[PDB]
């Protein structure tokens, strides 16, 4: 199937409480495989998936050097952006960055990404061409000029089309038993009377991987989008995910409702009903 690699960086200032914290996590699809936290007792890149453990000391040293350099770079960026928005030295602010590569089912580069945010708002993003930038405002335009002078987009394009795809393919091979295994959801429908006149039908999906799934309710073959309560997909803590969708139906009309499940682990989409 299709696979992606992403790094997620968070840099958080905390005036009067020390220097800004820098955290970086790395993912392959929905599997975290590395972490770095500048607040850790002795900051180092740590493994978070068993298939990354076979990487040698040169890998761990190289990652740690990069994240320690990022810790310093992001403290400078936080100072700079505070300046660009004429903000006071009193408030806490956050820079976030997410970047990485997407592969298609053939393992070829689909597209690259490199996006940054300030206080949870888009700030600057590398365009899909991997050559130009989209700056959100006049402050982000200042970062854009700096990045144009340092040839940043050219450096990112080289990385995204090169090392990013190369290392992602390596991880996919080393972790092929899990990363290239789709676990289909275990599905069932529960019934909960809410009154004499109505009952809740809840369609469950458990134990699936990756997190991407579609759970919908239909009444007489038509989608009940506005009347469906859909919870956010949530992690089980064992690599898999869970989700449910619920509809409040009139008593005696339960068999007019069907739950539809689509997942990569499913050859064909599933159709479920309440089984009394």
């Amino acid at each position: 199937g299709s696979h992606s690699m992403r790094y997620f960086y968070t840099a958080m200032s905390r005036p009067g409480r020390g220097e800004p914290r820098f955290i970086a996590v790395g993912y392959v699809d929905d599997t975290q495989f590395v972490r770095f936290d500048s607040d850790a007792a002795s900051p180092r890149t740590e493994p978070r998936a068993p298939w990354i453990e076979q990487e040698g000391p040169e890998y761990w040293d190289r990652n740690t050097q990069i994240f320690k350099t990022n810790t310093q770079t992001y403290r400078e960026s936080l100072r700079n952006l505070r300046g660009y928005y004429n903000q006071s030295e009193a408030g806490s602010h956050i820079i976030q960055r997410m970047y990485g590569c997407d592969l298609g089912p053939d393992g070829r580069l689909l597209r690259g990404h490199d996006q940054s945010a300030y206080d949870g708002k888009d700030y600057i993003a590398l365009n899909e061409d991997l050559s130009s930038w989209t700056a959100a405002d006049t402050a982000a335009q200042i970062t854009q000029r700096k990045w144009e002078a340092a040839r940043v987009a050219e450096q990112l394009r080289a990385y995204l089309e090169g090392l990013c795809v190369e290392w992602l393919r390596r991880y996919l091979e080393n972790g092929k038993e899990t990363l290239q295994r789709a676990d289909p959801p275990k599905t069932h429908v529960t019934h909960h009377p809410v009154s004499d006149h109505e009952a809740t039908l809840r369609c469950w999906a458990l134990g699936f991987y990756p997190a991407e799934i579609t759970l919908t309710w239909q009444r007489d073959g038509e989608d009940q989008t506005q009347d469906t309560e859909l919870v956010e997909t949530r992690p089980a803590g064992d690599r898999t995910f869970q989700k449910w969708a619920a509809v409040v139906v009139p008593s005696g009309e339960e068999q007019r409702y069907t739950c539809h499940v689509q997942h990569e682990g499913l050859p064909k989409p599933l159709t479920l009903r309440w089984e009394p």
Partner: peptide
């Protein structure tokens, strides 16, 4: 593997 060049904003 992460990107290795600094990106001061």
């Amino acid at each position: 593997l992460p990107f290795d060049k600094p990106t001061i904003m």
